[PDB]
């Protein structure tokens, strides 16, 4: 029954998922003065032109926009990655106030939200197999700050009213995730983990430097979602972020 409350929040996860205190947990704070430029990183390739969204789901901790990954449509390659990774879903983490909500931080700065585009390494054949490997996933993370609206986000925020509570889903076809990317693909990268249980240490993190801006009204509608299921007392879905974890031996590399 893990979650983000006082009794089931991130300081409790280790009891059911002892890897929470592992050697390569996420998220982390990105200290921009310790991260080193790595000229050996290859150019990053985000190929989302043929992405096919299917559905949007409130899963009790966030909402997933899910993609048909049965073929090689929307893929992420290059940068630190070896091979091809297929997009399977994206989701966000956000706070109750604009001063918090991201998972990664940048010189301890917290953004209002953070977008995660989750991809799995097609050499392992399916997602389930990929999450048994130290290079099975790649997550593209993008910070959200509040300012001007992101037009590319409005189809997402407008469907949220139809998936208010845990377990609800809605059809969500033809959504183009290219509409959520910033201008620059400059990034930081490090090896890490899922930020939610089961916290598997299977992820190459690629965190973009440039945030996207969304409006106060768009993030306010994120905060109207519910953690609870239908007819249950209302628990607003806010602060669904894990705080920064110990970097341990790892090295954060910059692509710029």
Ligand X SMILES: NS(=O)(=O)c1cc(C(=O)O)c(NCc2ccco2)cc1Cl
List the catalytic residues. 61
Number of residues that bind Zn ion (CB under 5 A): 4
Residue 195 assigned ligand-binding role = yes
Contacts to ligand X from residues 187-206, by CB under 6 A: 194-196, 198, 200, 203
Cβ contact 168:162 at 8 Å: yes
Report residue 79 as tokens.
Answer: 């940068």
- Considering only 110, 116, 150, 209, the residue that binds ligand X (CB under 6 A) is 116
Rounded Cα gap, residues 88 and 72, in angstroms: 11
CB of 222 to ligand X, least distance (A): 15
Rounded least distance, CB 168 to ligand X, Å: 16
Six-digit token pair at 42? 């290859």
Q: Return the closest-CA partner of residue 164 out of 223, 102, 216.
A: 223
Residues binding ligand X: number (CB under 6 A): 13
Query: Is the Cβ of residue 195 or residue 218 nearer to ligand X in the bound state?
Result: 195
Report the DSSP beta bridge partners of residue 45: 77
Contacts with Zn ion in 4-63 (CB under 5 A)? 59-61
DSSP state of 221: H
Residues pairing with 106 in the sheet: 30, 109
Under the binding rule (CB under 6 A), the answer on residue 137 touching ligand X is yes
Shortest Å, Cβ 195 to ligand X: 4
Residues 113-142 that bind Zn ion (CB under 5 A): 116
Q: Is 250 exposed, middle or buried (0-12, 13-18, 19+ CB in 10 A)?
A: middle
Q: Give me the residues that bind ligand X (CB under 6 A), please.
A: 61-62, 116, 118, 131, 137, 139, 194-196, 198, 200, 203
């Amino acid at each position: 029954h893990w979650g983000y409350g006082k009794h089931n929040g991130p300081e409790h996860w280790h009891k059911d998922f002892p890897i929470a205190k592992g050697e390569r947990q996420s998220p982390v704070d990105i200290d921009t003065h310790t991260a080193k430029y790595d000229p050996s990183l290859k150019p990053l390739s985000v190929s989302y032109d043929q992405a096919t969204s299917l559905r949007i789901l409130n899963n009790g901790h966030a909402f997933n926009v899910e993609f048909d990954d049965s073929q090689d449509k929307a893929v992420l390659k290059g940068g630190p990655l070896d091979g091809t990774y297929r997009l399977i879903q994206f989701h966000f983490h956000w706070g109750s106030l604009d001063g918090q909500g991201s998972e990664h931080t940048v010189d301890k700065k917290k953004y209002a939200a953070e977008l995660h585009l989750v991809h799995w390494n097609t050499k392992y054949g399916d997602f389930g197999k990929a999450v048994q490997q130290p290079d099975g996933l790649a997550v593209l993370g993008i910070f959200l700050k509040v300012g001007s609206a992101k037009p590319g986000l409005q189809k997402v925020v407008d469907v949220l009213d139809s998936i208010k509570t845990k377990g609800k889903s809605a059809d969500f076809t033809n959504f183009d995730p290219r509409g959520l990317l910033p201008e620059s693909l400059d990034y930081w990268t490090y090896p890490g983990s899922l930020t939610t249980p089961p916290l598997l240490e299977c992820v190459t993190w690629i965190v973009l430097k440039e945030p996207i801006s969304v409006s106060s009204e768009q993030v306010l509608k994120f905060r109207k979602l519910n953690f609870n299921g239908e007819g249950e007392p209302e628990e607003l879905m806010v602060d669904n972020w894990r705080p920064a974890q110990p970097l341990k031996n790892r090295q954060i590399k910059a692509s710029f």
